C-alpha cells in the first residue's frame, strides 16, 4: 500500500484520542452539595461506568478531576497538591456555581471565587447543583473536546 | 387558641410556668442574676454577670428541679454600640421537664470568660468557634485554637466591623509554584442596598425619645 | 435595524459599538459578537393603532394573568395616541 | 491615551494597567513568566500559540476573566501575525528553538520570523516592540544559534527602529535548560562532556530579573530604541559552575547523546554555546538601568535543583 | 410511643442452639445475602440511554435564563429592577434609560451564571414574566467567560426557547 | 505516641459528605488520640445571612445539611414564623410534614448506604439511590429543583402540590418497604456487617447528654427523646408513629434505629396522604406572603405588597428565638435575632454534626484505625452543617 | 473604671516576661521550620521576620493587649511546630508576589487617588 506521513499521524492521533476518551477515570473532590449530584450520576439511572468512566479513581491514576462543591481558602492548597500529583494528560471539570466562580458565597472572605484561580479548567458545568444529567452532558462534552486534540499532528509539523 | 387563622395562638399556661421558674432561679442565685424576661412566644432568658457562668450553669444542670442536662448551643452576638460588645448566649435543654432556657452574659475584647467545659463537655468546640469568629478568649479551656478559619488568618470574621469579603484572597502563582495570598480586589463590588423603610412598623417596640 | 459601524462591527439595539481605537474589540477576533436581530423598538412600531369608542381603555398586554398589570389609559388628547407603559401598544378614540 | 487603556485600580488581578501585549513564544520558558507578570497587574495579553490548546492550559490561571486571549498563528503566514498584533500596544517576541527541526532552521526561527513579526507590527500601528536576542550573539561565532541571533537582531533594528532589543546571558530557573542541563545530562548515563572547562567564563541571570527587566522596558519610556544586556551579579568559571551545581544536587562530580527526532536533548550546537564566553559590552545598559537588581545564583539555585537532589554546601568562586 | 430495635433474648433450648450452630458453621445467612444479589442480576437495569433517552422533568424545572417578549415582539422587561433586588446571589446587574421612543427599557441586563443559584426568585418577583428560567439544562461551556450573559444572550435564549417556555408557563401559571 | 498519622480525606472518595482532615496518634493498630480539623467547607454562611433579607437568606438553609434540604428550610421557617407571630395554614403544615418525612427517607438512605459503602458493602448504595432518584422527582415536581427546593418558606410553601403528585408519592411508598427489606437481607443479620458495627463506638447515656448529642445518637443509648413527640411543631401531634430505641449504644443499634426510622417515615407518609386537607398553602396575609400573580396584576394593594415583599422584604419584630426541629441527623436549630428591620441581625445555626464530630475522640478511644471509619459513618456527618 | 479582669499578666513586667519566652520558642524554631517546610529562605531571613513581627508591636503598654498578642503568637507557633500549616501558609509572611508599593508622595500621586 501507499500512505503519507500526514495520513499516518492523523490515524494514530484518532487511536490515542479514542482510547483516552473511552477510558476516563475521574477523581472527584466531593467538597459540598454538588458531590451528591455526582453520586447520582453514578447510580443506576445514568450509570457513568457504562461510558467507561469508573466510579472511583485514585488521584495518581486519575484522568480528570471533578471539582464538586465550594473551594474554601483552607482547602485550596490541598486541591492544587492533588492536581500536581495527577499524571498527564489531566483535565479539570468545574461543577456548579461554587466551583465555577464562587456562586452564592462569592462575596465570602473564606471562599475562592472560582477554582480557575487555582487550577486550569477545561469544562464548566453550570447549576446549583447541576442535575446528574447536566453533569453527564458535561463529561460527554469533555470526550468531544479530547476527540479534537491534535497532539501528534502538531508534533509532525514542529 | 382563637379562630384567627393567620395569627399564632398564645399559650398562657406556658408563660405562667416559665415566669414562676424565672423568679425561682433569681431567688436562688441573687448574687449573679441581673435580669429575667420571658418573651411573648414563651422563651425564658436569664441574664447574669459574667462571673456567675459556672455557678449558674452548674445549678441549672444539677438541681433536682432544673436538670438542664443538655447544652443545645453556645454562641456570641456582636453589638458594637454596647460597651461590652459581645453577648454570650447559652441555650440549654431539660429532658426531665421538657423545657428550654437561655442564659446570657457579656464581655469585651479584653475580658476573659470562664470556660463551661467543666459543666458541659459540649462547650469545648463551641468556645473554639466563639474565639475564632469573635475573638472572645475563654480562660481555663483545655485546647483553645482556631476551628473554622484558615491557618494564619488575621482577624475575627463574625465581628460587625470585619468586612464581608475580608482583606486577603488566595490564588495560585505559577512563578512561586504555590497558593499566594494577596490584597482582595473584586471585579464586581458587592452592592449595598438601603432597604429600611422610613416609616415605623411596630409601635409596641418604640423606644422613648432621647 | 442592524447597521454596521465603519470598522465593520454590528451595533446593538442599545446602540453600543466598540469605537475605532478600542482594544477591547480584540475579544471578537476569531469569534463573533452576539447581537439579537429582532429590535424591540422596530417591532412595536409595526403594530397598528387600536381605534376605540370610549375615553378610557384598559390594557393588560393580553393573556389575562400572563400579561402585565392592568393599566387604564386616557384618550382625551386628539393630537396623539395613547400608549401602554408596559407593552407599548397604542390606542386612539374613534372618529372622536 | 484612550479611555479604555487608562490605568485604574491598585495594580492587582482585577485592576487595569493599560498594557495590551501580544507575546509571541508565550508557551516557552521565558513566556510563562512574562505572561504571569503581565497578568498580575491586569494587562490584556494576547497569546498567539502554535501548539495544542492543551499545552497552553498553564497560562489560563495567570489572568483575570477575559485578560488572556489565545490565537492561532503561523510564522510563515503574515496575516495570522496581523490579527494578533492589530489591537496591541506592545509586541513582545520570545520565539526560539535550542535546536533545528526539519521545518524551521535557525535562520527561520531567528531571522525570517522575527523580521516578519516586526514588519507587521510597524504596519499595524504598534508602538513598542520588545525583541530578545543573546548576549553572546556574534556574526563570527561558530555556534549557528548565535550567528542567527546576530543577523535577526540586525533586521529588527532596521524594520522597527524604536524597538527595545534585550540581550540576556544564559538564563537559569526552575524550567531552564542551563542548570537543569548540568544536573541531568552531565550526570545520568554520562560523566561530564566538559571540553576544557577551565577556559570558559559564564555570567548567568535569574529568570525573574529578566522578566522584571522586560516589563519595566514596557513601562519605561526611555527604553525605546535602546539595546540592553542582562547579566548576573557574578562571573563564574564554567568548570566551577558545573561543580557547584553538582554539590547542590548531591551528585558526585568526576571531571570526564546523538541528536534525533522528538526533542534533541544535548546537541551539537548547544555544547558550542555552553562553551562560548559571556561577552562583556560595558556601553550597553543592563538591569541596573531598569530598576532591577540582578539576583545571586546561590540564592536561587537550591530552588532550581532541589528536585534532582536524591531523597553544609559551599559556594562557587567568582572571577573578578 | 417507642419500640425496642434490639432487645431480644436468644432461646437456650437445644433446637435453637443447634439452629445457630448450623448458621455459624454452614454460613446460612451469608448464602441468603448471595441470593438477594443473584435476584438483582436477573432484574432489569434502571439505566436509561442518555443522550438518546432523557430523565423526566416537569414544567416547573429551573434551568437556563432567558428574557421574553410580548406577542407583538416588544420586550416584556420594563427595567423595574425587582429581580436585581431579590436575587439572593446578586447575580443580576441592570442599567436602564428612556429608549428613543420614551419607553422604560434596560440598556444592560446581565446574569453572572456562575453566581446564580438557579433558585428562581427572579421569575417569582418579575411583574411582567420577562425573566424566566427555561427548560435547558445542557449549556456547559469550555471557558468561564462564556457563562457571563449580557442582554443579547438572554434575548437570544428567549428567541431560541420561547416555543417551549410559553407552553411550560401555560401549564403552571395557575399554580403560580 | 508511637506514631502520628495525619489522615486527610483531601483526595476524597465516593462519600460526598465533604472533606475531613483527621490527625491521629496510633499506638500500633489502636487509636490513642483523634483530632478532627474542620475548616475546609467553612463558607461564612452566618455572616452572609446578615446582608440578605429573610427571604433571600432561606436558600442558605438548603445548603447546610445538603441531604436534608427541606428539613433545614422548615427550621428556618418555624423560627421566622415564631418571630412574625403568624401561623401557616393547615394544608401547608401537612405538606411540610409530608416532605419532612420524604426528606428523612432521603437522609437515611444516604446515611446507611454510604456508611455501608465505606465498610466495603457497595451494592446497597446502588439499590437505594434508584429510590432517592425517584424521590428527587417529587422535589422537582413541586419546586422545580431536584435538591435545593427553596420550597418551605415562612408562612407555608411556595406553590401547591401539582395535580397527580400524591398518587405518585403513594405508588412510591407502596413499594418502598420491600426495598428496605432487601437492604436488611444484606446487612441486618450479616455476620461481617455485625462484626464491623456491634460494640463499636459505644456511647453511654450520661456522656451522650453532656456532650450535646441528639437524634439517633441519644436513642441508641436508650434515651427516650424525640422532638417530634415531646415538642411537636407542625401537625406531628396528629400522626401516630413509634420512636426506635437502642439498648447497647453501639453502631449496630444506631444502624437499626435509622432503618426503623425509615419504616416509621413510611408509616407517617401514609397518614399524610390520607389526611391531606384542602385550602390555601401560604398564610393569607400579604404583608408576609406574596399575593397570587393574578391578584398582583389586578389589585393595587397586591401590587404594592408584591413590590415591597420582593425588594425590602417583610420586617420582623425585634426579638430573639431558638427554634429546633428533629432533623434527620439530629436536633437542627437556629438562634435567630431580629433587630426589627427586614434583614436578620444574627443567625446562628446549630448543627447536630458539630457536636457529634467533636465527640469523635471520646468514641474512638480504644478502637482500631479501621473502626474510626465506622464511627464517623454512624454519626452521619455532613460538613455543610458542621462548618456552615 | 480602671479595674479590669486580667488575662494572664497583672502588670507589664509579667507580660514582658511571656513576650520574652515566646521569642525564645520562635527563635529556636526557624531552623527547624526552614527544613521541615523546605523553604527557600535562609534561617537569617526567617529570624529577621520574627524580629520584625515582634518589633511592630513595640508601643503596646496595656497588660491585657500583650497577653492576647502572646496568646495569638503561641497559637501561630503551635500550628508551625505541629506542621498543621503548609508551605504556603508559612511563606505568606514574606509577600513575595506583591509588587513594590511606593511610599513617597510623588509616587502615589502618579499611579492613583489612594491617599
Ligand atoms: C494501529 C495499530 C497500532 C497498535 C495499537 C495498539 C494495539 C492494537 C489495538 C488496536 C485498537 C483496535 C480498536 C480500535 C477502536 C476503533 C474505534 C471504534 O471502536 O469505533 C467506534 C467509534 C465511535 O465513535 P464515538 O467514540 O464518537 O461514539 C460516541 C458514542 N455514541 C456513538 C454512542 C454516541 O468510532 C470512531 O469514532 C472512530 C474513532 C477513531 C478510531 C481510530 C482507530 C482506528 C485504527 C487506526 C489505526 C491507524 C494505523 C495506521 C493505518
Ligand atoms: C506494551 C504494549 C501495550 C499495548 C499497546 C500500547 C499502545 C500502543 C499504541 C499507541 C501508540 C501511540 C504512540 C504515540 C504516543 C502518544 C503521542 C502523544 O500523545 O503526543 C505527544 C507527542 C507530541 O509531541 P510534542 O513535542 O508536541 O509534545 C510535547 C509538547 N511540548 C513540547 C510543548 C511539551 O507525541 C509524540 O511524541 C509522538 C512520538 C512519535 C510517535 C510515532 C510516530 C511515527 C509515525 C510518524 C512517522 C511517519 C514517517 C513516514
Ligand atoms: C445462591 C442461591 C441462594 C438461595 C437463596 C438463599 C437461601 O435459600 O438460603 C436460605 C437458607 C436458610 O437460611 P436461614 O434464613 O438463615 O435459616 C436457616 C435456619 N437455620 O440457607 C441455607 O440453607 C443455605 C445452606 C447451604 C449449605 C451450606 C453451603 C455449603 C457450601 C458447599 C456446597
Ligand atoms: N533561556 C535562555 O537561556 C535564553 C533565551 N533567549 C531567548 O529567549 C527566548 C525564549 O526563551 P525560551 O522561552 O527558553 O525558548 P523556549 O524554547 O522555551 O520557548 C520558545 C517559544 O517559541 C515558540 N516557537 C519555537 N519555534 C517556533 C516556531 N517555529 N513557530 C512558532 N512558535 C515557535 C515555542 O512555542 P511551541 O512550544 O508551541 O513550539 C515556545 O513557546 C528565545 O527567543 C531565546 O532565543 C536568549 C538568550 C538566553
Ligand atoms: S454550587 Fe450549589 S449545590 Fe453545588 S456546592 Fe455550591 S451551593 Fe451546593
Ligand atoms: S435564579 Fe435566583 S440566583 Fe439565579 S438570577 Fe434568578 S434570583 Fe438570582
Ligand atoms: S426582568 Fe422583570 S423584574 Fe427584572 S427588571 Fe425586567 S421587568 Fe423588572
Ligand atoms: Zn399593555
First to last CA, chain E: 40
Beta bridge partners, D47, equal D70
Alpha-carbon distance values, D5 to B199, C22, D88 (Å): 47, 8, 11
Q: In what order do the strands lie in the sheet with A123-125?
A: A26-29, A64-68, A91-95, A123-125
CA distance D92 to chain E (A): 25
Cβ pair C65:F293 closer than 8 A: yes
CA distance B199 to chain F (A): 11
Q: How many angstroms separate the CA atoms of F129 and F16, rounded?
A: 14
F119, F374 contact by CB (below 8 A):
yes
Residues 6+ apart with CB under 8 A from D314: D247
Which candidate from B150, B165, B171 shows the least CB-CB separation from A108?
Answer: B165
D58, A83 contact by CB (below 8 A):
no
Alpha-carbon distance values, E22 to A21, D308, E19, E27, F194 (Å): 52, 63, 5, 8, 18
Q: Output the CA angle F258-F220-F384, nearest 5 degrees.
A: 60
> Minimal CA–CA distance to F216: which of F175, F257, F270, F273?
F257
Q: Could you tell me how far CA B180 lies from the centroid of its own chain?
A: 34
Q: How many angstroms separate the CA atoms of D298 and D317, rounded?
A: 11
Extract the C-alpha cell encoding G66. Answer: 500583650
C-alpha F131 – ligand 6 centre gap (Å) = 29
Q: What is the 3-state secondary structure (H, E, C) of F88-121?
A: CCHHHHHHHHHHHHHHHHHHHHHHHHHHHHHCCC
Alpha-carbon distance values, B19 to A26, A74, D221, F209 (Å): 61, 46, 80, 26
Give, for B17, the enclosing helix (H) or strand (E).
helix B12-28
CA distance G88 to chain A (A): 7
Which residue in D has a C-alpha nearest to residue E147's C-alpha?
D65
Whose C-alpha lies nearest to ligand 2, atom 10? Answer: A16
Show binding-site residues of F for [4Fe-4S] cluster.
Answer: 251, 257, 272
Give residues (CB < 6 A) around ligand 4: D 25, 27-31, 49-51, 75, 94-97, 104, 109, 132, 134, 168, 170-171, 178
Is residue A150 exposed (0-12), middle (13-18) or buried (19+ Cβ within 10 Å)? Answer: middle
Whether A98 lines ligand 5, by a CB cut-off of 6 Å, is yes
F356, F254 contact by CB (below 8 A):
no
Helix axes F54-62, F69-84, angle to 10 degrees: 150
Which candidate from A80, A109, A119 shows the least CB-CB separation from B165?
Answer: A109
- The tally of domains found in chain D comes to 1
Which candidate from D52, D57, D104 shows the least CB-CB separation from A154?
Answer: D52
- Residue B13 CB neighbour total at 10 angstroms: 9
Report residue F245: phi and psi, to 5°.
-125, 130
Q: How many angstroms separate the CA atoms of D317 and D240, rounded?
A: 7
G99, G42 contact by CB (below 8 A):
no
Chains in contact with chain G (at least 3 beta-carbon pairs closer than 8 A) = A, B, D, F
C-alpha D3 – ligand 1 centre gap (Å) = 54
B178 inside 8 A of chain A by CB: yes
Please give the resolution of this entry in Å, rounded to 1 decimal. 3.0
Provide the domain limits for residue D37. 1-320
**Best mutation site among E29, E31, E35, E38 for ligand 3, i.e. most ligand atoms within 8 A of its Cβ?**
E31
Chains in contact with chain E (at least 3 beta-carbon pairs closer than 8 A) = A, B, C, D, F
Is residue A88 exposed (0-12), middle (13-18) or buried (19+ Cβ within 10 Å)? Answer: exposed
Best residue in F34, F47, F226, F388 to probe B by mutation, most B CBs within 10 Å? F47
> Minimal CA–CA distance to D37: which of B174, G88, A120?
B174
A8, A58 contact by CB (below 8 A):
no
Extract the C-alpha cell encoding D15. Answer: 485592576
Cβ pair F310:E120 closer than 8 A: no
Whether E48 lines ligand 3, by a CB cut-off of 6 Å, is no
Contacts of F13 in chain A (CB under 8 A): 56
| Cis, bond preceding A129 (omega within 30 deg of 0) | yes
Cβ pair B112:G7 closer than 8 A: yes
Q: How many angstroms separate the CA atoms of D234 and B183, rounded?
A: 35
Report residue A123: phi and psi, to 5°.
-135, 140
Please count the CA atoms within 13 angstroms of the CA of F38 that sit on its side-chain side.
26
> Minimal CA–CA distance to F108: which of F333, F330, F270, F357?
F330
Those residues whose beta carbon sits under 5 angstroms from the ion ligand 8 are: C 59, 61, 84, 86-87
Residues 6+ apart with CB under 8 A from D108: D75
Extract the C-alpha cell encoding A126. Answer: 453550570
Ligand sitting nearest the alpha carbon of E113:
6
D92 inside 8 A of chain C by CB: no
> Minimal CA–CA distance to D19: which of D55, D1, D43?
D43
- Residue D119 CB neighbour total at 10 angstroms: 17
Q: Output the CA angle B86-B91-B92, nearest 5 degrees.
A: 145
A157, E163 contact by CB (below 8 A):
no
Whose C-alpha lies nearest to ligand 1, atom 34? Answer: E51
Which candidate from G5, G64, G96 shows the least CB-CB separation from B176?
Answer: G96
Extract the C-alpha cell encoding C49. Answer: 393603532
Provide the domain limits for residue G13. 1-115
Write the DSSP string, chain G.
Answer: ------SS-SSHHHHHHHHHHHHHHHHHHHHHHHHHTT-SS-HHHHHHHHHHHHHHT-S---HHHHHHHHHHHHHHHHHHHTT-S-HHHHGGGG--SSPP---SHHHHHHH-S--
Chains in contact with chain B (at least 3 beta-carbon pairs closer than 8 A) = A, D, E, F, G
C-alpha F308 – ligand 7 centre gap (Å) = 14
**Best mutation site among A38, A40, A69, A124 for ligand 5, i.e. most ligand atoms within 8 A of its Cβ?**
A69
Alpha-carbon distance values, E130 to F294, F305, G50 (Å): 16, 19, 60
A76, B179 contact by CB (below 8 A):
yes
Contacts of F6 in chain G (CB under 8 A): 83
> Number of CB pairs < 8 Å for B and G?
48
- Cell numbers 464511627: residue: F375
Q: How many angstroms separate the CA atoms of G45 and D145, rounded?
A: 41
Q: How many angstroms separate the CA atoms of E156 and E145, rounded?
A: 17
Q: Could you tell me how far CA F214 lies from the centroid of its own chain?
A: 12
Contacts of C34 in chain E (CB under 8 A): 150, 152-153, 156
> Number of CB pairs < 8 Å for C and E?
70
- Cell numbers 409530608: residue: F98
F179, F356 contact by CB (below 8 A):
no
Q: How many angstroms separate the CA atoms of A143 and E17, rounded?
A: 60
Whose C-alpha lies nearest to ligand 1, atom 11? Answer: A15
Which residue in A has a C-alpha nearest to residue F110's C-alpha?
A36
E77, E106 contact by CB (below 8 A):
yes
Q: How many angstroms separate the CA atoms of D51 and B169, rounded?
A: 33
What SS3 state is found at D130?
strand
Best residue in D13, D59, D65 to probe E by mutation, most E CBs within 10 Å? D65
Extract the C-alpha cell encoding A6. Answer: 500526514
Q: How many angstroms separate the CA atoms of E124 and F290, rounded?
A: 9
Is residue E113 exposed (0-12), middle (13-18) or buried (19+ Cβ within 10 Å)? Answer: buried
Whether A33 lines ligand 5, by a CB cut-off of 6 Å, is yes
What SS3 state is found at E76?
coil
Alpha-carbon distance values, G96 to D153, F76, G17, G54 (Å): 34, 45, 33, 20
> Minimal CA–CA distance to F273: which of F166, F347, F156?
F166
Experimental method: cryo-EM
> Minimal CA–CA distance to F143: which of F156, F134, F152?
F152
Cβ pair F185:E32 closer than 8 A: yes
What SS3 state is found at A149?
coil
G with D: 3 or more CB pairs under 8 Å? Answer: yes
A96, A56 contact by CB (below 8 A):
no
Cβ pair B183:D13 closer than 8 A: no
B158, B78 contact by CB (below 8 A):
yes
Is the torsion defined by CA of E127, E133, E134, E135 positive or negative? Answer: negative
Whose C-alpha lies nearest to ligand 7, atom 2? Answer: E126
Q: How many angstroms separate the CA atoms of G31 and D122, rounded?
A: 55
- The tally of domains found in chain G comes to 1
Beta bridge partners, E62, equal none
Pairing status of strand F30-37 against strand F21-27: antiparallel
Task: Give Dmax over CA atoms of chain D in angstroms.
Answer: 63
Amino acid at each position: 500500500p501507499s500512505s503519507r506521513g500526514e495520513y499516518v499521524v492523523a490515524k494514530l492521533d484518532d487511536l490515542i484520542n479514542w482510547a483516552r476518551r473511552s477510558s476516563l477515570w475521574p477523581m472527584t473532590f466531593g467538597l459540598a452539595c454538588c458531590a451528591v449530584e455526582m453520586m447520582h450520576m453514578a447510580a443506576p439511572r445514568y450509570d457513568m461506568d457504562r461510558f467507561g468512566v469508573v466510579f472511583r479513581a485514585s488521584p495518581r491514576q486519575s484522568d480528570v478531576m471533578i471539582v464538586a462543591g465550594t473551594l474554601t481558602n483552607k482547602m485550596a492548597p490541598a486541591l492544587r497538591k492533588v492536581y500536581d500529583q495527577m499524571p498527564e494528560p489531566r483535565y479539570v471539570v468545574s461543577m456548579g456555581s461554587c466551583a465555577n466562580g464562587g456562586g452564592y458565597y462569592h462575596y465570602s472572605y473564606s471562599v475562592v471565587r472560582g477554582c480557575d484561580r487555582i487550577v486550569p479548567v477545561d469544562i464548566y458545568v453550570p447549576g446549583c447543583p447541576p442535575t446528574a444529567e447536566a453533569l453527564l452532558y458535561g463529561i460527554l462534552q469533555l470526550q468531544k473536546k479530547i476527540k479534537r486534540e491534535k497532539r501528534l499532528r502538531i508534533w509532525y509539523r514542529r | 387558641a382563637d379562630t384567627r387563622p393567620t395569627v399564632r395562638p398564645r399559650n398562657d399556661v406556658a408563660h405562667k410556668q416559665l415566669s414562676a421558674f424565672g423568679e425561682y432561679v433569681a431567688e436562688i442565685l441573687p448574687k449573679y442574676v441581673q435580669q429575667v424576661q420571658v418573651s411573648c412566644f414563651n422563651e425564658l432568658e436569664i441574664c447574669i454577670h459574667p462571673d456567675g457562668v459556672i455557678p449558674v450553669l452548674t445549678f441549672l444542670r444539677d438541681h433536682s428541679n432544673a436538670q438542664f442536662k443538655s447544652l443545645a448551643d453556645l454562641t456570641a452576638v456582636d453589638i458594637p454600640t454596647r460597651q461590652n460588645r459581645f453577648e454570650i448566649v447559652y441555650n440549654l435543654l431539660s429532658l426531665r421537664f421538657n423545657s428550654r432556657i437561655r442564659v446570657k452574659t457579656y464581655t469585651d475584647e479584653l475580658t476573659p470568660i470562664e470556660s463551661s467545659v467543666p459543666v458541659y463537655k459540649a462547650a469545648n468546640w463551641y468556645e473554639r468557634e466563639i474565639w475564632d469568629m469573635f475573638g472572645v478568649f475563654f480562660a481555663n479551656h483545655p485546647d483553645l485554637r482556631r476551628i473554622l478559619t484558615d491557618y494564619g488568618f488575621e482577624g475575627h470574621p463574625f465581628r460587625k466591623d470585619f468586612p464581608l469579603s475580608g482583606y486577603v484572597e488566595l490564588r495560585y502563582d505559577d512563578e512561586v509554584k504555590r497558593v499566594v495570598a494577596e490584597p482582595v480586589e473584586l471585579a464586581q463590588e458587592f452592592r449595598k442596598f438601603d432597604l429600611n423603610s422610613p416609616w415605623e412598623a411596630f409601635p409596641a417596640y418604640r423606644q422613648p425619645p432621647e | 435595524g442592524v447597521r454596521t459601524s465603519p470598522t465593520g462591527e454590528k451595533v446593538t439595539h442599545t446602540g453600543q459599538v466598540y469605537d475605532d481605537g478600542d482594544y477591547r474589540k480584540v475579544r471578537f477576533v476569531g469569534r463573533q459578537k452576539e447581537v439579537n436581530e429582532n429590535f424591540a423598538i422596530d417591532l412595536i412600531a409595526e403594530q397598528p393603532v387600536s381605534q376605540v369608542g370610549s375615553r378610557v381603555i384598559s390594557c393588560d398586554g393580553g393573556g389575562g394573568a400572563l400579561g402585565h398589570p392592568r393599566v387604564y389609559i386616557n384618550l382625551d388628547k386628539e393630537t396623539k395616541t395613547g400608549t401602554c407603559g408596559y407593552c407599548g401598544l397604542q390606542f386612539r378614540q374613534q372618529h372622536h | 491615551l484612550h479611555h479604555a487603556v487608562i490605568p485604574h485600580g491598585k495594580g492587582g488581578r482585577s485592576s487595569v494597567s493599560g498594557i495590551v501585549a501580544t507575546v509571541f513564544g508565550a508557551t516557552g520558558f521565558l513566556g510563562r513568566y512574562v505572561v504571569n507578570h503581565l497578568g498580575r497587574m491586569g494587562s490584556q495579553v494576547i497569546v498567539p500559540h502554535r501548539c495544542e490548546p492543551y499545552d497552553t492550559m498553564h497560562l489560563r490561571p495567570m489572568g483575570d476573566l477575559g485578560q488572556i486571549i489565545f490565537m492561532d498563528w503561523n510564522g510563515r503566514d503574515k496575516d495570522s501575525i496581523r490579527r494578533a498584533v492589530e489591537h496591541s500596544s506592545v509586541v513582545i517576541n520570545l520565539v526560539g528553538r535550542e535546536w533545528e527541526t526539519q521545518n524551521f532552521d535557525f535562520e527561520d526561527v531567528f531571522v525570517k520570523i522575527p523580521q516578519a513579526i516586526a514588519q507587521v507590527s510597524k504596519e499595524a500601528g504598534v508602538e513598542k516592540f520588545i525583541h530578545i536576542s543573546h548576549l553572546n550573539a556574534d556574526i563570527k561565532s561558530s555556534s549557528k544559534y548565535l550567528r542567527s541571533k546576530a543577523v535577526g537582531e540586525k533586521e529588527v533594528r532596521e524594520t522597527f527602529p524604536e524597538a527595545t532589543i534585550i540581550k540576556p546571558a544564559e538564563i537559569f530557573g526552575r524550567e531552564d535548560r542551563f542548570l537543569n542541563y548540568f544536573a541531568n545530562i552531565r550526570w545520568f548515563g554520562g560523566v561530564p562532556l566538559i571540553s576544557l572547562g577551565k577556559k570558559t567564563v559564564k555570567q548567568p541571570v535569574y529568570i525573574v530579573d529578566v522578566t522584571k527587566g522586560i516589563i519595566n522596558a514596557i513601562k519605561d519610556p526611555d527604553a525605546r530604541g535602546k539595546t540592553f544586556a542582562f547579566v548576573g551579579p557574578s562571573r563564574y568559571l564554567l568548570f566551577d559552575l558545573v561543580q557547584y551545581v553538582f554539590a547542590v544536587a548531591h551528585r558526585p562530580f568526576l571531571p570526564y547523546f546523538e541528536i534525533s527526532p522528538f526533542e534533541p536533548w544535548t546537541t551539537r550546537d548547544k555544547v558550542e554555546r555552553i562553551h562560548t564566553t559571556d561577552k562583556i559590552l560595558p556601553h550597553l545598559p543592563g538591569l541596573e538601568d531598569l530598576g532591577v537588581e540582578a539576583t545571586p545564583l546561590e540564592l536561587k539555585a537550591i530552588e532550581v535543583l532541589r528536585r534532582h537532589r536524591t531523597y553544609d554546601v559551599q559556594p562557587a568562586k567568582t572571577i573578578p | 410511643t417507642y419500640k425496642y430495635v434490639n432487645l431480644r433474648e436468644p432461646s437456650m433450648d437445644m433446637k435453637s442452639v443447634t439452629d445457630r450452630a448450623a448458621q455459624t458453621l454452614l454460613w446460612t445467612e451469608l448464602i441468603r445475602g448471595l441470593g438477594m444479589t443473584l435476584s438483582y442480576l436477573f432484574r432489569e437495569p434502571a439505566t436509561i440511554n442518555y443522550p438518546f433517552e432523557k430523565g423526566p422533568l416537569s414544567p416547573r424545572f429551573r434551568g437556563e435564563h432567558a428574557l421574553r417578549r410580548y406577542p407583538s415582539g416588544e420586550e416584556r422587561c420594563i427595567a423595574c429592577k425587582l429581580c436585581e433586588a431579590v436575587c439572593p446571589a446578586q447575580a443580576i446587574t441592570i442599567e436602564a434609560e428612556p429608549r428613543a421612543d420614551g419607553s422604560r427599557r434596560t440598556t444592560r441586563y446581565d446574569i453572572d451564571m456562575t453566581k446564580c443559584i438557579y433558585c428562581g426568585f427572579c421569575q417569582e418577583a418579575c411583574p411582567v414574566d420577562a425573566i424566566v428560567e427555561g427548560p435547558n439544562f445542557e449549556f456547559s461551556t469550555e471557558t468561564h467567560e462564556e457563562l457571563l450573559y449580557n442582554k443579547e444572550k438572554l434575548l437570544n435564549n428567549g428567541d431560541k426557547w420561547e416555543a417551549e417556555i410559553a407552553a411550560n408557563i401555560q401549564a403552571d401559571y395557575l399554580y403560580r | 505516641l508511637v506514631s502520628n498519622l495525619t489522615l486527610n480525606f483531601g483526595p476524597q472518595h465516593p462519600a460526598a459528605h465533604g472533606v475531613l482532615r483527621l490527625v491521629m496518634e496510633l499506638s500500633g493498630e489502636m487509636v490513642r488520640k483523634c483530632d478532627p480539623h474542620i475548616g475546609l467547607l467553612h463558607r461564612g454562611t452566618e455572616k452572609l445571612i446578615e446582608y440578605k433579607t429573610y427571604l433571600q437568606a432561606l436558600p442558605y438553609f438548603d445548603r447546610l445539611d445538603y441531604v436534608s434540604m427541606m428539613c433545614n428550610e422548615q427550621a428556618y421557617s418555624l423560627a421566622v414564623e415564631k418571630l412574625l407571630n403568624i401561623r401557616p395554614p393547615p394544608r401547608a403544615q401537612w405538606i411540610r410534614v409530608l416532605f419532612g418525612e420524604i426528606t428523612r427517607l432521603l437522609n437515611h438512605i444516604m446515611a446507611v448506604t454510604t456508611h455501608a459503602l465505606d465498610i466495603g458493602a457497595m451494592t446497597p448504595f446502588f439499590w437505594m439511590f434508584e429510590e432517592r432518584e425517584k424521590m428527587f422527582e417529587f422535589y422537582e415536581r413541586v419546586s422545580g429543583a431536584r435538591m435545593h427546593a427553596a420550597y418551605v418558606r415562612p408562612g407555608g410553601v411556595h406553590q401547591d402540590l401539582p395535580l397527580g403528585l400524591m398518587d405518585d408519592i403513594y405508588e412510591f411508598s407502596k413499594n418502598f418497604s420491600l426495598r428496605i427489606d432487601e437492604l436488611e437481607e444484606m446487612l441486618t443479620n450479616n455476620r461481617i456487617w455485625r462484626n464491623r458495627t456491634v460494640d463499636i463506638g459505644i456511647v453511654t447515656a450520661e456522656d451522650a447528654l453532656n456532650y450535646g448529642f441528639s437524634g439517633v445518637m441519644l436513642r441508641g443509648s436508650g434515651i427516650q427523646w424525640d422532638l417530634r413527640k415531646t415538642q411537636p411543631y407542625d401537625v406531628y401531634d396528629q400522626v401516630e408513629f413509634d420512636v426506635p430505641i437502642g439498648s447497647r449504644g453501639d453502631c449496630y443499634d444506631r444502624y437499626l434505629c435509622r432503618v426503623e426510622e425509615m419504616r416509621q417515615s413510611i408509616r407517617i407518609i401514609s397518614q399524610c396522604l390520607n389526611k391531606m386537607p384542602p385550602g390555601e398553602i401560604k398564610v393569607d396575609d400579604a404583608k408576609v406572603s406574596p399575593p397570587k400573580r393574578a391578584e398582583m396584576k389586578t389589585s393595587m394593594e397586591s401590587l404594592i405588597h408584591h413590590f415591597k415583599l420582593y425588594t425590602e422584604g417583610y420586617q420582623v419584630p425585634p426579638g430573639a428565638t431558638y427554634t429546633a426541629i428533629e432533623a434527620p441527623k439530629g436536633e437542627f436549630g437556629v438562634y435567630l435575632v431580629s433587630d426589627g428591620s427586614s434583614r436578620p441581625y444574627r443567625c446562628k445555626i446549630k448543627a447536630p454534626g458539630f457536636a457529634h464530630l467533636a465527640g469523635l475522640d471520646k468514641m474512638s478511644k480504644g478502637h482500631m484505625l479501621a473502626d474510626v471509619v465506622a464511627i464517623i459513618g454512624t454519626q452521619d456527618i455532613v460538613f455543610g452543617e458542621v462548618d456552615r | 473604671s480602671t479595674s479590669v479582669k486580667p488575662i494572664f499578666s497583672r502588670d507589664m513586667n509579667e507580660a514582658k516576661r511571656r513576650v520574652r519566652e515566646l521569642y525564645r520558642a520562635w527563635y529556636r524554631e526557624v531552623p527547624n521550620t526552614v527544613h521541615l517546610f523546605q523553604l527557600d529562605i535562609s534561617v537569617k531571613q526567617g529570624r529577621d521576620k520574627v524580629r520584625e513581627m515582634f518589633k511592630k508591636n513595640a508601643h503596646i503598654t496595656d497588660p491585657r493587649v500583650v497577653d492576647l498578642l502572646v496568646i495569638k503568637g503561641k497559637m501561630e507557633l503551635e500550628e508551625t511546630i505541629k506542621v498543621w500549616k503548609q508551605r504556603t501558609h508559612v511563606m505568606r509572611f514574606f509577600h513575595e508576589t506583591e509588587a513594590p508599593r511606593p511610599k513617597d508622595f510623588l509616587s502615589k500621586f502618579y499611579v492613583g487617588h489612594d491617599p
